[PDB]
Paper text:
To gain insight into the earlier observed activation of the enzyme by phosphate and a possible interaction thereof with the metal, phosphate was included into the crystallisation and soaking studies. Neither was the case for SwHKA. Docking studies did however reveal a potential docking site, close to H44. The docking does however support the earlier proposed function in the pyruvate deprotonation, studied by H/D exchange. In both cases 100–300 fold improved deprotonation rates were observed. This could be enabled by a phosphate in concert with H44.
Here structural analysis of hydroxyketoacid aldolase from Sphingomonas wittichii RW1 (SwHKA) revealed a dynamic movement of the metal cofactor between two coordination spheres without protein scaffold rearrangements. Holo‐SwHKA forms a trimer of homodimers, in which each monomer adopts an (α/β)8 triosephosphate isomerase (TIM) barrel fold. In total, holo‐SwHKA contains six equivalent active sites; each of which is formed from amino acids from two different domain‐swapped dimers. The transition from M2+ R to M2+ A,S is induced by bidentate substrate binding and occurs without a concomitant rearrangement of the protein scaffold.
Numbering used by the authors:
A (entry chain BBB), C (entry chain BBB), F (entry chain BBB): 0 to 251
B (entry chain AAA), D (entry chain AAA), E (entry chain AAA): 1 to 250
The structure:
Amino acid sequence: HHNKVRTCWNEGRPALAGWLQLPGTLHAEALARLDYDAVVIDMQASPIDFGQVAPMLIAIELGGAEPFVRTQVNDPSDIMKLLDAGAYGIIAPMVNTRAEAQTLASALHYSPRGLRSFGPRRPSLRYGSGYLAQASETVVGLAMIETREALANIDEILSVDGIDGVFIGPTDLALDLGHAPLVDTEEAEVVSAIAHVRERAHAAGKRVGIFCGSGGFARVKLAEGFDFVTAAPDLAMLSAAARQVIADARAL
Amino acid sequence: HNKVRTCWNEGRPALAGWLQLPGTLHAEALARLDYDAVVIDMQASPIDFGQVAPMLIAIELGGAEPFVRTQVNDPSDIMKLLDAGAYGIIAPMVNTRAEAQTLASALHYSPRGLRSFGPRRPSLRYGSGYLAQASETVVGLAMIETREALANIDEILSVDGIDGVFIGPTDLALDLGHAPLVDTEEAEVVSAIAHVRERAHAAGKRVGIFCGSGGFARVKLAEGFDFVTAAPDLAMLSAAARQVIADARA
Amino acid sequence: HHNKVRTCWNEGRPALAGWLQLPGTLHAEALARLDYDAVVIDMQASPIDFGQVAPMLIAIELGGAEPFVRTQVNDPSDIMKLLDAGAYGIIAPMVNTRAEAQTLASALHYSPRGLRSFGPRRPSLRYGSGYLAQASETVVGLAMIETREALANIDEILSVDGIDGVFIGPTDLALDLGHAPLVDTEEAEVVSAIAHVRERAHAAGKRVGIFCGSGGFARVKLAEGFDFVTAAPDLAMLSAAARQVIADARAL
Amino acid sequence: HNKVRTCWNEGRPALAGWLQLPGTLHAEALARLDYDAVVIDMQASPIDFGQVAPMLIAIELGGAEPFVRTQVNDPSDIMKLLDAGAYGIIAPMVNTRAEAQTLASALHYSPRGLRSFGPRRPSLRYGSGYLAQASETVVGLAMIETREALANIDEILSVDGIDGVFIGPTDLALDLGHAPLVDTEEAEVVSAIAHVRERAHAAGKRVGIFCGSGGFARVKLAEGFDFVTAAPDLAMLSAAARQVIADARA
Amino acid sequence: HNKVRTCWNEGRPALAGWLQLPGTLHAEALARLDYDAVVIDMQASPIDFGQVAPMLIAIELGGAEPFVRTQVNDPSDIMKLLDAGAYGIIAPMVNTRAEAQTLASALHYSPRGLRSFGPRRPSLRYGSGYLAQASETVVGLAMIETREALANIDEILSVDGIDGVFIGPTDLALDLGHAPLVDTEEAEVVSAIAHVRERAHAAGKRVGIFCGSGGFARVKLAEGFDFVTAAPDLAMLSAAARQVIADARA
Amino acid sequence: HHNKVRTCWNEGRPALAGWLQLPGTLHAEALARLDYDAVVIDMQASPIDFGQVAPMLIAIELGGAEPFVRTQVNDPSDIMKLLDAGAYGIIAPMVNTRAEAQTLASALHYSPRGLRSFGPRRPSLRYGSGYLAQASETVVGLAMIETREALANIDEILSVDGIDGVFIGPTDLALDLGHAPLVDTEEAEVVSAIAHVRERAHAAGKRVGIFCGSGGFARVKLAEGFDFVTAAPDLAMLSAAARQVIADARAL
Ligand SMILES: [Br-]
Ligand SMILES: [Br-]
Ligand SMILES: [Br-]
Ligand SMILES: [Br-]
Ligand SMILES: [Br-]
Ligand SMILES: [Br-]
Ligand SMILES: [Br-]
Ligand SMILES: [Br-]
Ligand SMILES: [Br-]
Ligand SMILES: [Br-]
Ligand SMILES: [Br-]
Ligand SMILES: [Br-]
Ligand SMILES: [Br-]
Ligand SMILES: [Br-]
Ligand SMILES: [Br-]
Ligand SMILES: [Br-]
Ligand SMILES: [Br-]
Ligand SMILES: [Br-]
Ligand SMILES: [K+]
Ligand SMILES: [K+]
Ligand SMILES: [K+]
Ligand SMILES: [K+]
Ligand SMILES: [K+]
Ligand SMILES: [K+]
Ligand SMILES: [K+]
Ligand SMILES: [Mg+2]
Ligand SMILES: [Mg+2]
Ligand SMILES: [Mg+2]
Ligand SMILES: [Mg+2]
Ligand SMILES: [Mg+2]
Ligand SMILES: [Mg+2]
């Protein structure tokens, strides 16, 4: 009866999260049982549709991590349907303005404050009869910052009451700033924009998260005081692992 | 051409991947690496027929030969996989000459076997001349994973329509009364594995083995195994995630 | 060659409809064969995606009820794709203004009147060569009223020619009015808003429907003159049935 | 711990649900009620392997022991379900000692049985010590639903690696030449059911029975059945919908 | 009423479609044409159990009798399809009297067969009186596609609980040592087909045949075949696409 | 390492494309192996959802045709998710204005020019390390013209840099112009509108495509100088083929 990520935050500790682009329940449960606080299912940059995400949410919860979803789009109806299938964290892409941040917030919180239509099939099964009274505490909402526009509007985005904070896509932001889409980019202008977003989030009493393609980059983001750090995509980790096995198999 | 048969004909072994996770994205990604084949495991996995069919397509597009380790040595299951574009079959728990004949029966059209004719996907790959070359398009391996199979190895190896045998050494270790550890050092298990390889090669047949690491696969390739698998997607992903978490958390 | 709900209405009788949150064909056919006029597949408050709804529509039609869908969102493209998969009724959520009601109407009716793109795979198979001439008669459209805003705008929503009327979500409306989200709520201010919506719908010569969580509440709504009454969700009925079986099994 | 085995060890019977409808939402909802187990029916249903795998996860998360009544008493089917996190197996049409041995063979690793080693989901639940306790993590029941099974009951009950027997009384009623009605009063069927229960308990084994109502389940629990199912999701949903329509329409 | 049995009782043959492509849209479209039945092929196809179940519903809604050519002559597979609303079964590779008895066993409730009782979809179509008329609701055909089946035709035809036999002439052609061409002119294959039809009709049983063209189907209907299939969806779609491309490109 | 449709266009030849309304991999591969340059998966007028389209894209590529998709809606997030699953052509429905054309263009092209979020799972596997440098060349984008509005706005739609041109739905346009929704319509006012769209596209140095229900209509469109011609839907071709087989089987 607690959001493991919110528990980290209440204890003044960051959360570390997995990131899934591969559909299916077996790896979702296996990674959830590791020392991840949360596992993010990527519904944007992946072939994962609503039918495949539903059982993955169950597998992550059984594994003992907080099931999160990076949605395809910042659409209230998509977000609310995921919340009712038992997503306890939402990362909404392309939140560029305060109004888009307000749209995310609307989807996360019960009417009349939010417009979250009531029908909590899975949350009411997990939280029991105590759910409705603490329902907002059960869910984490992060607005994705991945554009020039979002960067310029960071303070108005952070001003929105009903979001926990923001989530940086460093490669997506590098590309929108006119740089190479390097995994775990350290391009100086992107490094500077990222540091600005983290400063403004902590200045507003809000959380800041970031996507990492490696354990090494995630270690640095944790040291820099990021509150929510993802590492690393299942497909990327599996492809790298297979490449290393083949090289060792084929070595003189 | 069957890329594994191409390896063998050019005098080199095949290195293969091993998938227990369903879906097309990782199957294509791994097939595009320096694997000659990718085995889809329909036994020690939740991969059912519906999920295997597009995975076979993904492996072929990625540039590896699609193989299936079947749930069971059942002719009608095997034939449906061949018609879906499985070009390699690894049949579990082949323990007797009769069971190896059952496998051989599934892999060949009459008069050589009793394979039903309806080659939906192979006929698209090979065209209207498929029948004449059908047997050579597919590689068939009988799994050796029990004391009984070990006792019956020459009788199994005598069956004409199988390419050879594939050692399941974790199951074999367990059946011999040892720890079911992959890549085992247990002297009796190592001896049995070497014995199967020698008997296969003496009978002019191929021998494969399931491996859990690149380092063990390198040794098996050095010992002259024709078909070596390393390592299951779920095992490699789990190990990689554990290492990323250790790096992140310091 | 008739919409069973429209047949009820033409005979001056209300329609009673089932409500499905569980994906699959077997229970959809079984409930369709009961004395339901229609069965509503809930694509909003459920894990039911487009791939699972398509065969459920077939199962409901074979069972001999009118297949209806409560859409995830009032989006024309989603609605038109359901109509072409053989949804003969649409309930659109969160219709709060005349313009949102016009958007629903646009999706229900053939170009140029509506913008219903032409490609009626399943309807043309059911209705045959007579379909196009009577196609608007084959489909029922209800705008969901579940907000303060929709309540204030009820007359402008009801003014839209191409919708059959409105569908009340009593729990969703209770919550937006600042009350407890009680199943089959009789909270006085919600009771009053619901009676106002029914009065204004009948005043405009339009139909009014309502969601019920029980046969008892549905009986009262039918007596109050509601034209389309749903009772009760498959998950709710199955959970209650199992709870009663266990209590009888475990009783002294 | 297997919650059904926990019931038995603490001297109480298990009450189980019975699912013929595929999907995770109702499976989790019913598992969260006061059921010790939830049986997924893969025989008298459209539930295939792809649909069962996430249903097992949903039942375990809801707090009941996931059981499967298999389509058939086939070792390789049973083993794939065990590796998917089926912790109870009810095998249909077990009619002879040989067929009960076939069931027992699937449920245990060598040397006790021939269960293939690849415990994808149990190893996540039980960890690396799974092998040592594997047999106790799973409950195996042979279904008695024919005159032949009734005639061979002591020979079936003699097989070491099965927990006992599960009566399918509608099939049994039909095979005895009576109406296939659930929860039957037919004297010969009632007598046969009592006979099986007595023989099971005399042989120190468990006996279960399929029920269509809470009232019948209460009697079976009173008569000392160890494992009682009530009632199929589709039957309960259909009855509930009929009652709601009767209430609505007056 | 089984529409194929209605054809036979009114003294006309049945013409059936044949589906190798999964999904409901084409299954309903083809069932709405002047086909008496539509056969779903679960053998020479990627159609698994999950995909067949809604296809049966689509065929019935479209106004044809849903039939399945099973992957294999396996009683438990057949029974699950009957409970899903398969009203016709074509069992492949029925080669002996024993194998025909195995088929017959699956199609009938005790005492006539050993069909397990759980008629999920038939009980919705036929209601509570289903048991009494169950056997007549289903049509069972043993496939003749081997020299062995041809040699054992009268022994196969002697089995009481099968309606008759369905010739797989491409497999039969191949097994006789000829080209596996549909609608063949090969004299020995044509002679064998005629022989099977004569023996079936002499034994008071029905005979069907798989066809690749309307023109061949017309001849078979003229020769007195009771059940004629023309032609597979994938073959017809491929031929139609080739013709559209030829018309477009000139 | 080339878009087969772009190859046609660079050689000054039209492309001929298949059109799939039936889900599944077997017919998709079989038709892709025929003399089609591209095969279009119809996600609008079909029951094909995201889960079924993903493997169909693979089957078409393996068959040796360019995998295209006609999207349910002109939504950037839906389009980008298809591009990352290996759609190399996009047909967006109901593009009625320059702004809707700009929205399509935004989805097709990498940030910062487009807003195409970076995560090319399948394209980077096909094109290898050379992908990012030539990524815009790998994808074809066509704005669907199927309304009076789109017809009036054709020049402002064609003015948008980042679209390859337009795709005519003759039946959809006939219906919006107040005519019969005839397959391969030759209704004079629709014939005139279609000729105007082709003239204005070629006048703007842009490509024009068209949907055909037959090989005969497609032959005429190819002769009229259309750059991209689809013929004919799998369901339509299969239904016609089965009808002809039955008539030949049942003939005296
Ligand atoms: Br860990
Ligand atoms: Br990123
Ligand atoms: Br590599
Ligand atoms: Br032997
Ligand atoms: Br092994
Ligand atoms: Br391993
Ligand atoms: Br009723
Ligand atoms: Br409500
Ligand atoms: Br309870
Ligand atoms: Br016995
Ligand atoms: Br029973
Ligand atoms: Br029952
Ligand atoms: Br016709
Ligand atoms: Br015989
Ligand atoms: Br044949
Ligand atoms: Br053919
Ligand atoms: Br061609
Ligand atoms: Br059109
Ligand atoms: K889906
Ligand atoms: K964890
Ligand atoms: K490769
Ligand atoms: K009804
Ligand atoms: K429980
Ligand atoms: K018909
Ligand atoms: K081609
Ligand atoms: Mg709502
Ligand atoms: Mg055959
Ligand atoms: Mg359109
Ligand atoms: Mg094994
Ligand atoms: Mg039974
Ligand atoms: Mg992005």
